[PDB]
């Protein structure tokens with residue numbers, strides 16, 4: 001006797017501006033389908049990787065799947081809600097519109113220090129390697145067949161010296177430069 005939404009729909013669509021949601025009618029039935037996986041209401045971090053197994057049953061994005069969590073599930077919560085979930089899930093795609101793209105400096109900044117360093121870059125770098133398949137690992141330049149050998153390619157592309165800490169401000173431009181950059185540190 002009442003129109004249901006799923007505890008979320010008007011708060012998210014509010015984002016209609018940044019990035020064009022696949023379809024306002026998408027995150028609608030997607031809310032219940034989740035309630036079925038568990039009559040709960042909070043997604044854990046250990047089970048977060050249990051999902052990536054649907055869109056990538058090939059490689060083992062299990063190492064990079066745990067990084068996308070603290071990426072935005074640190075908002076003083078401890079659990080990922082469906083609202084913030086659609087944001088990240090659709091961010092890894094939904095094409096490239098205006099603004100946005102800022103959520104990227106969030107997944108790469110694991111610790112979250114307003115600035116990225118070689119360490120964090122190393123973790124996400126090695127993890128991303130797992131997602132890559134050996135059969136395809138032969139395509140990338142051998143000058144970086146290992147996480148320790150590539151850190152020089154990525155960090156070398158940007159070019160840090162005095163302020164050896166990449167900020168979220170440039171993290172967006174340093175990439176807007178050569179469209180062939182985001183291809184390396186690419187994420188899915």
Ligand SMILES: *C(=O)CCCCCCCCCCCCC
Nearest residue numbers: 001002003004005006028029032
């Ligand atoms: C109020 O009268 C009860 C809630 C009515 C909800 C309307 C939708 C009912 C149909 C749900 C199943 C539809 C499957 C396509």
Ligand SMILES: [Ca+2]
Nearest residue numbers: 073077079080
């Ligand atoms: Ca959260």
Ligand SMILES: [Ca+2]
Nearest residue numbers: 112113115116
């Ligand atoms: Ca940091």
